[PDB]
Coordinates of C-alpha atoms in Angstrom, one line a residue:
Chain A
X253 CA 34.9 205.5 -42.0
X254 CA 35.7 202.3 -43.6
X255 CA 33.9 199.0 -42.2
X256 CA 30.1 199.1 -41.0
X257 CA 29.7 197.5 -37.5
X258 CA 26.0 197.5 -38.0
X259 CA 23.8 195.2 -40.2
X260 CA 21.3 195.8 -43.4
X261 CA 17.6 194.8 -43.3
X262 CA 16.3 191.4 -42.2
X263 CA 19.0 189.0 -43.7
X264 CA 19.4 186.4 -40.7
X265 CA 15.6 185.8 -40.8
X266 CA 15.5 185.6 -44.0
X267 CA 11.7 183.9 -43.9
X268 CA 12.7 180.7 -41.7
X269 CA 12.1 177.6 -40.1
X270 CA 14.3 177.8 -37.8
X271 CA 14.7 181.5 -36.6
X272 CA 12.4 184.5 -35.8
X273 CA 13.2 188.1 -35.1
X274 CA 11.7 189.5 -31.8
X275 CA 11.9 193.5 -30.7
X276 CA 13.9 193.3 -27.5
X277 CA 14.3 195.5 -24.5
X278 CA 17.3 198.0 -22.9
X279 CA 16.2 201.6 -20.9
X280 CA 19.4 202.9 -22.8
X281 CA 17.5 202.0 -26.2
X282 CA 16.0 199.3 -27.0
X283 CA 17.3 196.3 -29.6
X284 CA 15.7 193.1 -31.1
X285 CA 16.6 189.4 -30.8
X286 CA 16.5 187.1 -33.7
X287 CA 15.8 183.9 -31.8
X288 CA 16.3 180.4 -32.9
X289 CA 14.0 177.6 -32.4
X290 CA 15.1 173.8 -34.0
X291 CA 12.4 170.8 -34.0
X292 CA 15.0 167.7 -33.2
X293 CA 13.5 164.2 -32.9
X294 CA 14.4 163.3 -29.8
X295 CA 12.0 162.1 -26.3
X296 CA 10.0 165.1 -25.4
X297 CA 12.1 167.1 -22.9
X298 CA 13.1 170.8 -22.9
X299 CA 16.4 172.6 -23.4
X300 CA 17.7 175.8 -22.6
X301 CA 20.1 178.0 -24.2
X302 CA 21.5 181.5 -24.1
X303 CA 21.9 181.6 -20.2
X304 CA 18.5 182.1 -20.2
X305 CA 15.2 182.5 -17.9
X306 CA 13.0 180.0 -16.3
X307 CA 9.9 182.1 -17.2
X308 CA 10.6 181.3 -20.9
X309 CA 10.9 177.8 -20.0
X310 CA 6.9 178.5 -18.7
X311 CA 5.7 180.3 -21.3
X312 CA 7.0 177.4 -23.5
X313 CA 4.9 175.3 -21.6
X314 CA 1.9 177.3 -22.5
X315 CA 2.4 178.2 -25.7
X316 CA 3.1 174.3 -26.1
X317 CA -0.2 174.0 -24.6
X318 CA -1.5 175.8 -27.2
X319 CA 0.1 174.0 -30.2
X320 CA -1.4 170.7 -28.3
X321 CA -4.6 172.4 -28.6
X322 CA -4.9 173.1 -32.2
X323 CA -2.7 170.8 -34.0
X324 CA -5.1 171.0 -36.7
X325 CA -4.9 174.6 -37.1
X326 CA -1.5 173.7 -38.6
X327 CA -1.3 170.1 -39.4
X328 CA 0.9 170.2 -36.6
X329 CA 2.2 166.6 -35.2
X330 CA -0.1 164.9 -32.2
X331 CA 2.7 163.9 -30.0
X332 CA 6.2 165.9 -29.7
X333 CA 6.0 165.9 -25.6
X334 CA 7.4 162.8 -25.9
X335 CA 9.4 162.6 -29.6
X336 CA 10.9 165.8 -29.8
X337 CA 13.4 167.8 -27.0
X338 CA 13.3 171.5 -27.8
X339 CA 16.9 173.3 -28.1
X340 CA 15.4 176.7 -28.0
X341 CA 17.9 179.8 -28.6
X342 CA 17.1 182.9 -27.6
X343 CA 20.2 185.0 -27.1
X344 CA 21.3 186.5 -23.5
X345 CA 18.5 185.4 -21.7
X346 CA 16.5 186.3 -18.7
X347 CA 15.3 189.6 -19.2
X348 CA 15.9 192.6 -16.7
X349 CA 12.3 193.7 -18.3
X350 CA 11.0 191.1 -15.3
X351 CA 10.2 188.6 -17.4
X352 CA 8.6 188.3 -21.0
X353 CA 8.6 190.8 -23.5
X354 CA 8.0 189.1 -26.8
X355 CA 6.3 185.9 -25.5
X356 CA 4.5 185.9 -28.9
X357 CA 7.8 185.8 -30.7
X358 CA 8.7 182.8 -29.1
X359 CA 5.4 181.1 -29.6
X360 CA 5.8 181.7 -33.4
X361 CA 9.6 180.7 -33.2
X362 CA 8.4 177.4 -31.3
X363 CA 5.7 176.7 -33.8
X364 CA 7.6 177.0 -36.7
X365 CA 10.1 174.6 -35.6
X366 CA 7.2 172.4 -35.1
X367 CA 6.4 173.2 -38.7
X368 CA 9.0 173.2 -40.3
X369 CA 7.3 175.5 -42.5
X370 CA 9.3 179.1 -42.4
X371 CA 8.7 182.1 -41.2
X372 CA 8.0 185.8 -42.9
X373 CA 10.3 188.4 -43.0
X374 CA 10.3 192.8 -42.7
X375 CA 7.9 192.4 -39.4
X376 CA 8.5 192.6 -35.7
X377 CA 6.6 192.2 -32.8
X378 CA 6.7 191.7 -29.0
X379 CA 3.8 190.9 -26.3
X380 CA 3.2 188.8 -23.1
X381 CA 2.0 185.4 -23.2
X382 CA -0.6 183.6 -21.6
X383 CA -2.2 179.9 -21.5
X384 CA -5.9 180.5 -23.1
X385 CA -4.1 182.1 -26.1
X386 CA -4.7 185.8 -24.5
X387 CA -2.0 188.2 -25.7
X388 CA -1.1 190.9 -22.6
X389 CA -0.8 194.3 -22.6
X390 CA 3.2 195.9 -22.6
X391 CA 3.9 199.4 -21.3
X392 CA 6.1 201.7 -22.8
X393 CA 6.7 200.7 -26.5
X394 CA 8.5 203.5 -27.9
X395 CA 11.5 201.6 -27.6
X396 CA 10.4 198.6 -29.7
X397 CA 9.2 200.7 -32.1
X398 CA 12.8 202.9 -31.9
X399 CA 14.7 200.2 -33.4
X400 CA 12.4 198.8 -35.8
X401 CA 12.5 201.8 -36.8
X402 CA 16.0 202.0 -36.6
X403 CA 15.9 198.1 -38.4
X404 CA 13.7 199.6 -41.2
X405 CA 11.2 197.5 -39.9
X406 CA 7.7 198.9 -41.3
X407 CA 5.0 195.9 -40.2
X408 CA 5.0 195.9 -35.9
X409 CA 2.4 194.1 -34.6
X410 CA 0.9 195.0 -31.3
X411 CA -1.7 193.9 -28.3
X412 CA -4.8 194.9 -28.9
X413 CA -5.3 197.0 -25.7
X414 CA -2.2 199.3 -26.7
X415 CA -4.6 200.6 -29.3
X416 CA -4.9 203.8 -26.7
X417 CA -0.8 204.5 -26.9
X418 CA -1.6 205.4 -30.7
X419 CA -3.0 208.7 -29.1
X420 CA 0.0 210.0 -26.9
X421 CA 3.3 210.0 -28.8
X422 CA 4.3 211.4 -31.9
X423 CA 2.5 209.8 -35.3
X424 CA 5.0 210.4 -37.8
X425 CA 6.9 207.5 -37.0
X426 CA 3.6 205.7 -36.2
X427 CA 2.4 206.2 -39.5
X428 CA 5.7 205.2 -41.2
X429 CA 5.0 201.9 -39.9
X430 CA 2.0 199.9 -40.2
X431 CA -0.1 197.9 -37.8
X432 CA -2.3 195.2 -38.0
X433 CA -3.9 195.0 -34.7
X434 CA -3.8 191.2 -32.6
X435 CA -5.4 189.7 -29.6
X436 CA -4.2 186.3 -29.5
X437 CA -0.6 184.5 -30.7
X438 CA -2.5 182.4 -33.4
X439 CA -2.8 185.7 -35.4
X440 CA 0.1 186.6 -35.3
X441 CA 1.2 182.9 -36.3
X442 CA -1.0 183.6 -39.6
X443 CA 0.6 186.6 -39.8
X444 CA 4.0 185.6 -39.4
X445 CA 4.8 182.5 -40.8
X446 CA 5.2 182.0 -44.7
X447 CA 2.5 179.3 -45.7
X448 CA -1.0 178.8 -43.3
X449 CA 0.0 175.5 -42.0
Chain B
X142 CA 45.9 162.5 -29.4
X143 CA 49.4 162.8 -31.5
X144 CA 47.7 164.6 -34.4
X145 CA 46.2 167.0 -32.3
X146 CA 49.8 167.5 -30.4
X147 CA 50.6 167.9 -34.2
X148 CA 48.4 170.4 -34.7
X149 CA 49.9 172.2 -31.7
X150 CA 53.5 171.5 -33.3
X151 CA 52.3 173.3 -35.8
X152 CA 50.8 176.6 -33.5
X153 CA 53.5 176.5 -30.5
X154 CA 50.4 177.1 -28.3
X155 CA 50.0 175.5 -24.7
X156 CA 48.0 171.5 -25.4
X157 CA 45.2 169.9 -23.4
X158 CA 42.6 167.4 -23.2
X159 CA 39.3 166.8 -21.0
X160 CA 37.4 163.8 -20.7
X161 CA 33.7 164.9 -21.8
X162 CA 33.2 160.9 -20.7
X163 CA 32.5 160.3 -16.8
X164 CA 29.5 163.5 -17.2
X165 CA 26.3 162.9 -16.0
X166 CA 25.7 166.3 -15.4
X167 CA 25.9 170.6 -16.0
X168 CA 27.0 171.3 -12.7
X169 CA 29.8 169.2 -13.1
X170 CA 31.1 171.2 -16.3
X171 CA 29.9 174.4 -14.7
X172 CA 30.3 174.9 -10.7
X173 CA 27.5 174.6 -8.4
X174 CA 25.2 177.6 -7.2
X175 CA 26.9 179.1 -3.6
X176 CA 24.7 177.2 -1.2
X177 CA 26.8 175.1 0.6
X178 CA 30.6 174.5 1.8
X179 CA 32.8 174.0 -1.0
X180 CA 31.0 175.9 -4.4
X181 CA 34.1 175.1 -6.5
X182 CA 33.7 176.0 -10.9
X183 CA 33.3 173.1 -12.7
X184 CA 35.6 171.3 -15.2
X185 CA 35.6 173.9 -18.1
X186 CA 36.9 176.6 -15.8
X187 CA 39.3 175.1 -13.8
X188 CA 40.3 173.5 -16.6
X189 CA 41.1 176.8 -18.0
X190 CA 43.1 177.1 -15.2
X191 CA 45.0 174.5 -16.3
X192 CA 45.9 176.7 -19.7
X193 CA 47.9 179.6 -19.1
X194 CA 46.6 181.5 -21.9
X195 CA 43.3 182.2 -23.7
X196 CA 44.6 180.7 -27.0
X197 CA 45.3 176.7 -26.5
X198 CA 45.3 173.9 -28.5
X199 CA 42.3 172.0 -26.7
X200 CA 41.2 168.2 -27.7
X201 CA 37.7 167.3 -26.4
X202 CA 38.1 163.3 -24.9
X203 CA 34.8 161.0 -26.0
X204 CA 32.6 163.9 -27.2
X205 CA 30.3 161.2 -28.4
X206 CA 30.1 159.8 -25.2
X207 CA 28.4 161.7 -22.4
X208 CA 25.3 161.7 -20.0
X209 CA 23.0 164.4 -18.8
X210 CA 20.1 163.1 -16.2
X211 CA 18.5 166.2 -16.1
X212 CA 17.0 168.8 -18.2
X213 CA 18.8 169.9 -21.8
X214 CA 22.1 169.0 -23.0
X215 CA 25.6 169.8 -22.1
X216 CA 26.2 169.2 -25.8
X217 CA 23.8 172.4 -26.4
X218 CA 27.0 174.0 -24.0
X219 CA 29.4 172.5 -26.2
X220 CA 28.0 174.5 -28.8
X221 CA 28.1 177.3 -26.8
X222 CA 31.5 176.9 -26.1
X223 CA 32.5 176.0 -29.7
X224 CA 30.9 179.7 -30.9
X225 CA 33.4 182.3 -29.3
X226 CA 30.4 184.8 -29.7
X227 CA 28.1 182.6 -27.7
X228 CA 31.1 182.3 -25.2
X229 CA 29.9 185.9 -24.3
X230 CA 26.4 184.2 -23.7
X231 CA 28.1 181.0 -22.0
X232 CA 26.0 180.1 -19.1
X233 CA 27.8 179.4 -15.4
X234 CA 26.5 178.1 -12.8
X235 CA 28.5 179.2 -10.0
X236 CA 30.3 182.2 -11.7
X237 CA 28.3 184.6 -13.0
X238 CA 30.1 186.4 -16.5
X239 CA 30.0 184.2 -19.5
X240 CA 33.5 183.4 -20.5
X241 CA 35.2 183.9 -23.6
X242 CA 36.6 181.1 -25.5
X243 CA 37.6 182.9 -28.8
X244 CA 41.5 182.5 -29.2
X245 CA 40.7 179.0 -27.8
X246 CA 41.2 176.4 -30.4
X247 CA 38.8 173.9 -31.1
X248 CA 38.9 170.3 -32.2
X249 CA 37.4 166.9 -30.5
X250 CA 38.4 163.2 -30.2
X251 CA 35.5 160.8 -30.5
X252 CA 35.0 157.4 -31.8
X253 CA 31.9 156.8 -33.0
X254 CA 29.3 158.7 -35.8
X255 CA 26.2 157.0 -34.8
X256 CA 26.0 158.5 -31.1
X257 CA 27.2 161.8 -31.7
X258 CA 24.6 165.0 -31.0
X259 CA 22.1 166.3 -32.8
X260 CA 23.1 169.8 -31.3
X261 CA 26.5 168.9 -32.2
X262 CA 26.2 167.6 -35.8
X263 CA 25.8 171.4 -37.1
X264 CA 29.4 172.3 -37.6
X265 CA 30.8 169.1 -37.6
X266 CA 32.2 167.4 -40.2
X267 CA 33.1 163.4 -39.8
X268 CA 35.8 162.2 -41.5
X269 CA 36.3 158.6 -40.9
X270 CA 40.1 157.8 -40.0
X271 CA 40.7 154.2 -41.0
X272 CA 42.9 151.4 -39.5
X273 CA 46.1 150.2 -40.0
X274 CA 47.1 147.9 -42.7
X275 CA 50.1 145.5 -41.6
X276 CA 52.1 146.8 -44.5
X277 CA 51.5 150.0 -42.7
X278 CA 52.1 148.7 -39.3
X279 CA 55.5 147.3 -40.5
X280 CA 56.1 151.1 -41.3
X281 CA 55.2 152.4 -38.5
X282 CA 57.1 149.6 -36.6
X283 CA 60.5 150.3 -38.2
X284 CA 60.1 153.8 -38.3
X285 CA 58.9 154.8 -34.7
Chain C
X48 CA -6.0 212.3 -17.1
X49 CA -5.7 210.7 -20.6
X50 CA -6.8 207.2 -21.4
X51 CA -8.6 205.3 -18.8
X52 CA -6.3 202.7 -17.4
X53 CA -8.9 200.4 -16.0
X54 CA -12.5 199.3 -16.5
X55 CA -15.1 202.0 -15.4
X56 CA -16.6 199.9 -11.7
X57 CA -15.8 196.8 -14.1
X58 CA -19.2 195.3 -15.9
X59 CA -18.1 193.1 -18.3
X60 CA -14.8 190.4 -18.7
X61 CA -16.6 188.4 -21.3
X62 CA -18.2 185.3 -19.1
X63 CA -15.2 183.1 -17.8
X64 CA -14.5 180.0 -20.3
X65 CA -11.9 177.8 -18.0
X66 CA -10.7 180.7 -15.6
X67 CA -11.9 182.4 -12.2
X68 CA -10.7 185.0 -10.2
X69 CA -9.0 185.0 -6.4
X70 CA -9.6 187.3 -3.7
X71 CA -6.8 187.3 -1.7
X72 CA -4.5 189.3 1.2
X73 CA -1.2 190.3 0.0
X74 CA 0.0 192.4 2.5
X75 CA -0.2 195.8 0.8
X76 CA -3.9 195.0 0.8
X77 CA -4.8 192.2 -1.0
X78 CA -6.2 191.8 -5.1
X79 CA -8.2 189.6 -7.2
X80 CA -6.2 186.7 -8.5
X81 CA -7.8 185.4 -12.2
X82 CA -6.4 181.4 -11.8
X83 CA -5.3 180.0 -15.5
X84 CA -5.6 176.3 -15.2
X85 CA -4.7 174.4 -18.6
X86 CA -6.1 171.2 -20.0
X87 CA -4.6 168.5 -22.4
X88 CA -5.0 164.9 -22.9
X89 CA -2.0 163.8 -21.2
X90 CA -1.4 161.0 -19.3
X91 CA -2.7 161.6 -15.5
X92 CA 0.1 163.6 -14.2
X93 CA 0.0 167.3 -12.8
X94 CA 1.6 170.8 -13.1
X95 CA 1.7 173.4 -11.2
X96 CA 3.0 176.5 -12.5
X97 CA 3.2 180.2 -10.8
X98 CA 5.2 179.8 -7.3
X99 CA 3.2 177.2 -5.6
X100 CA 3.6 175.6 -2.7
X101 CA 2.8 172.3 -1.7
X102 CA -0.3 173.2 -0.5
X103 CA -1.7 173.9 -3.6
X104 CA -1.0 170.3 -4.9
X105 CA -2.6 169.1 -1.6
X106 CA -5.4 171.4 -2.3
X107 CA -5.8 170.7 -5.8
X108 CA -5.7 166.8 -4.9
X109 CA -8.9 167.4 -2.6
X110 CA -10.4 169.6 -5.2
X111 CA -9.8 166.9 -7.6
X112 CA -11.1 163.9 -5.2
X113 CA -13.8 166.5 -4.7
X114 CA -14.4 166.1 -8.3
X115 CA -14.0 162.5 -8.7
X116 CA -16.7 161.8 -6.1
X117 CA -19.1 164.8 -8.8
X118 CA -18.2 163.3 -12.2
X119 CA -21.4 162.1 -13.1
Chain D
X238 CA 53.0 143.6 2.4
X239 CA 56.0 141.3 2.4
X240 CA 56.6 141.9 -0.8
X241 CA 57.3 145.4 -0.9
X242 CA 59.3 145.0 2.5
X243 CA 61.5 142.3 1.2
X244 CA 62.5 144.9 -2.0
X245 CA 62.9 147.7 0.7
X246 CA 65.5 145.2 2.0
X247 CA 66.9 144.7 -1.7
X248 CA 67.1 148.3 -2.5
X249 CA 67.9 149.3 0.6
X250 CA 65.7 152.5 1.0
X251 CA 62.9 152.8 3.8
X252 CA 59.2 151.0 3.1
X253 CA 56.5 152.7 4.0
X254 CA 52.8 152.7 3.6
X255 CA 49.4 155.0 3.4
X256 CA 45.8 153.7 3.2
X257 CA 43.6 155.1 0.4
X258 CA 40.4 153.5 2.2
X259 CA 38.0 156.1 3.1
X260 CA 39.6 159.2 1.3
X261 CA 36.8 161.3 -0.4
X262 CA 38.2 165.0 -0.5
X263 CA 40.8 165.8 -3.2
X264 CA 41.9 168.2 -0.5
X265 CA 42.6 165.3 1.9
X266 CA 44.7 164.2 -0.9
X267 CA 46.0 167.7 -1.9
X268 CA 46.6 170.7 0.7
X269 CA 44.5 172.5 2.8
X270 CA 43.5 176.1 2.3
X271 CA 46.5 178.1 3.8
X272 CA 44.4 180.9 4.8
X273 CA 44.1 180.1 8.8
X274 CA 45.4 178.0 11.1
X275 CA 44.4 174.6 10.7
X276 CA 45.4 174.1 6.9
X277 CA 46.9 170.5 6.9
X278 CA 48.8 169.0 3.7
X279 CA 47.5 165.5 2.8
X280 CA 48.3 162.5 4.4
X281 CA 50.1 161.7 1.5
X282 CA 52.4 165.0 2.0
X283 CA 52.2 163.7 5.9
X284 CA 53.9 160.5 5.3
X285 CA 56.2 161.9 2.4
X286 CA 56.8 164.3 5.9
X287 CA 57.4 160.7 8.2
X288 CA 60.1 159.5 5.7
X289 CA 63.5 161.9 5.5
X290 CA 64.6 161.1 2.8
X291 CA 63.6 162.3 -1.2
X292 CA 63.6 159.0 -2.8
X293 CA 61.3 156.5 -0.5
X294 CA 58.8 153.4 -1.5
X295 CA 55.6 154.5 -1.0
X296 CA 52.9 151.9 -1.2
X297 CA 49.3 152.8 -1.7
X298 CA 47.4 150.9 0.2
X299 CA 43.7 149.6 -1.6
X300 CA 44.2 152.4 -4.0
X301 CA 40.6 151.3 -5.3
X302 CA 38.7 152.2 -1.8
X303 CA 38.4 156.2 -2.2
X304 CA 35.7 157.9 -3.7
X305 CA 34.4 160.4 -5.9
X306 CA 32.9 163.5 -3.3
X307 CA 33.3 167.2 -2.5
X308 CA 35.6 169.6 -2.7
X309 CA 37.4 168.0 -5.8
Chain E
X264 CA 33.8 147.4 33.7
X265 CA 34.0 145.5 36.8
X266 CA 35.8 143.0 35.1
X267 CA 38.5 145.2 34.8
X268 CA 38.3 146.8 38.2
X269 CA 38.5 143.1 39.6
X270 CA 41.9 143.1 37.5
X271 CA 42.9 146.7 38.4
X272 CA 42.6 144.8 42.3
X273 CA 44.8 141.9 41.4
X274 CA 47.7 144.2 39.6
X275 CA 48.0 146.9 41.9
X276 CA 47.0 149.6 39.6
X277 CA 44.9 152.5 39.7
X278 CA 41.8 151.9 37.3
X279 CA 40.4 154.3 35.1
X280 CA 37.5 155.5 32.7
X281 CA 37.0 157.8 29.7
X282 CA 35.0 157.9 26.9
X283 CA 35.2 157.8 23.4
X284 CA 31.7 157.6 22.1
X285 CA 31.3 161.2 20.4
X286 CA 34.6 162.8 19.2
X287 CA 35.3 163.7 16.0
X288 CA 39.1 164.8 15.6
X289 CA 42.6 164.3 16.8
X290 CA 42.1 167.7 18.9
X291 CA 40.6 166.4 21.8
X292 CA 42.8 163.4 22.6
X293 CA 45.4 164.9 20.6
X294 CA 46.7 168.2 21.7
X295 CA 45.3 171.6 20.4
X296 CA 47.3 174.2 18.4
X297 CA 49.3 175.1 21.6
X298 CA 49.5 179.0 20.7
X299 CA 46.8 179.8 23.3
X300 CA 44.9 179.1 26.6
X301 CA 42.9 175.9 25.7
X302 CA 45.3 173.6 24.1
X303 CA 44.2 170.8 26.9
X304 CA 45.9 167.1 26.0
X305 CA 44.2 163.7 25.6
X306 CA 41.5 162.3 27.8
X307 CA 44.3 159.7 28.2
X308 CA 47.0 162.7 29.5
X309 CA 44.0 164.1 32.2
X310 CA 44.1 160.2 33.4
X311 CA 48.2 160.5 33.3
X312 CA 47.7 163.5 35.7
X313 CA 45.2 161.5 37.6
X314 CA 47.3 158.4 38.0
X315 CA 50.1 158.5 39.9
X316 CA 52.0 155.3 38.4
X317 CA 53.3 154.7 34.8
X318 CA 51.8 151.8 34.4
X319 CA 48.0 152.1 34.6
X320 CA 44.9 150.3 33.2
X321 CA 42.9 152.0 30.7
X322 CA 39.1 151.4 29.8
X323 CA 38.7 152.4 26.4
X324 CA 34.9 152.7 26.4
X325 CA 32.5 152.7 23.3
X326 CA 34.7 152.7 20.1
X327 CA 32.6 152.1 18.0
X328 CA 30.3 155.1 18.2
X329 CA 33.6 157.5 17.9
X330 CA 33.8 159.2 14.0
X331 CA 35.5 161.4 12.1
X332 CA 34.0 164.6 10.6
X333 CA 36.8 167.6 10.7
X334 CA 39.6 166.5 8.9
X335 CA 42.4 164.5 11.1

């Protein structure tokens, strides 16, 4: 067969700063988006990039909102709203899953620009977002868990009301990969990036 | 200019340049959404009208000098043009399929290194081009 | 009928912190709308997220008013 | 004026003149869509069209008065 | 305009008025695209069927409330 089109485990995370891998979304099987988040010093605006959503633009907002409201939870600087424009990439961008998928993804890509502090590697994950920190419920996760699967992913971390879709599908790919249940983005921010700050 | 004609002497591949100067805005690179009489494509696409193939020999005029009013960078599209994979994730604001710029060939004309952007100074590299010493201006004169 | 979907004649939502619910008509019968409304020290200025109208930002200025003649 | 009359005199070819106050369409430079009736070419393709001859002296009048608006 | 018509008295001419406050194009005092029912000349050429003489007097009312929108 020759050349490989398709790649080897996680080795464009690589545990970073500046990128996160997200589980991502097609009905003719699913994928996952590596997505790219650099701090820049700059006056506080936002960017765009990837031909991207407007609801991602919000969410930034809120998870924003929630770095502004434990900075020191992370020793994370006290002004970047006005210091720091935000050149998040996510790739092709507003999703025909209406909306969010992996709004927690984001959040942890977002804060670890912030950081500067990098990331953790061989785990996936994928949620909605919210402003108090509350982590919502996704339908239909076989896909997610499909290609991560299919990534040799093993850690895929979940909402903590999909606990009930352990019970319906087959376990011996559930099994094969292991779960640390969430509730809220700041766990999965312990979870995900490399040091605590 | 000349060295990037050079450059093309050396290809044999159509030649252009675009001011990136005189932008204030996006939807004056991209075209404007259909919601009024005359949604026209921007500068980049027209300005690929201008090429008659998908591999030029572009220059870029005052890279380092642009505006934006408004929210994110064009410079953030610059990169996106510069990558041909992110040319398939281009954004457009009148057409709707992002076009590819691969076979496209890529190099800038600026003047300065303190103003140029932050999105922009990955996969640059500035190379300071010095003046012209009178010995070297006699050789120029005499020669050209 | 598998898992339950919903709460059971819902009893409990953890007492609301900074949120509150919305009765309202949408037209194929209307639903409760749980408000978020976020709070940072910023610098006197507003947002307004989820498709609002203008009317919201004239209602939330009289709420507000409404609130700077209760502060103390 | 005079001045580009008197060298119409010298060289002996035809003067004429076109205002650039007031244009703000490229297209009123350029063509008009020919894609119905009522497509005009610009007034600068209309007063190439008053002089019959290919080598005239066109002056631009106030070439500094246009602006920079719609359609190009 | 009685000024004038005390003129039009002394010259033996045959006074008349039209408009010009509220036009837009060179269709309506120019012809129209004479390839159909409707191409009607100038105000000016309904007054040259009016008068009678070749040498009439002309009120040209209200010029500076006439624009230019469509091109021409």
């Amino acid at each position: 067969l020759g050349i490989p089109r398709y790649r080897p485990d996680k080795a464009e995370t690589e545990p970073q700063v500046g990128t996160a891998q997200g589980l991502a979304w097609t009905p003719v099987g699913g994928t996952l988006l590596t997505i790219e988040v650099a701090a820049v010093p700059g006056s506080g605006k936002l960017s765009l990039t990837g031909q991207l959503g407007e609801v991602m633009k919000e969410s930034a907002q809120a998870a924003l909102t929630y770095l502004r409201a434990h900075t020191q939870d992370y020793g994370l600087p006290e002004d970047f709203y006005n210091k720091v424009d935000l050149h998040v990439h996510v790739p092709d961008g507003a999703t025909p899953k209406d909306g969010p998928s992996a709004g927690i993804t984001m959040a942890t890509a977002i804060a670890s620009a912030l950081s500067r502090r990098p990331a953790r590697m061989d785990i996936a994950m994928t949620g909605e977002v919210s402003l108090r920190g509350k982590v919502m419920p996704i339908g239909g996760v076989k896909e997610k868990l499909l290609a991560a699967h299919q990534a040799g992913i093993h850690k895929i971390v979940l909402p903590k009301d999909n606990e009930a879709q352990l019970e319906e599908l087959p376990k011996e790919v559930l099994e094969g990969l292991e779960i640390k249940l969430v509730e809220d983005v700041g766990e999965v921010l312990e979870y995900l990036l490399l040091p605590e700050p | 200019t000349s060295l990037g004609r050079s450059i093309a002497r050396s290809m044999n591949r159509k030649f252009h340049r675009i001011s990136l100067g005189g932008v204030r805005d996006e939807a004056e690179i991209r075209g404007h959404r259909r919601t009024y009489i005359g949604a026209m494509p921007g500068k980049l696409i027209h300005a690929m009208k201008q090429v008659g193939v998908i591999n030029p020999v572009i220059l870029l005029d005052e890279i380092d000098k642009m505006s934006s009013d408004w929210r994110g960078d064009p410079a953030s599209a610059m990169l996106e043009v510069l990558d041909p994979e992110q040319n398939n994730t281009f954004t457009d604001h009148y057409l709707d399929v992002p076009y590819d710029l691969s076979k496209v060939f890529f190099i800038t004309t600026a003047n300065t290194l303190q103003t140029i952007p932050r999105p922009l100074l990955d996969r640059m590299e500035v190379i300071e081009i010095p003046g012209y010493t009178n010995m070297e201006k006699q050789a120029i004169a005499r020669q050209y």
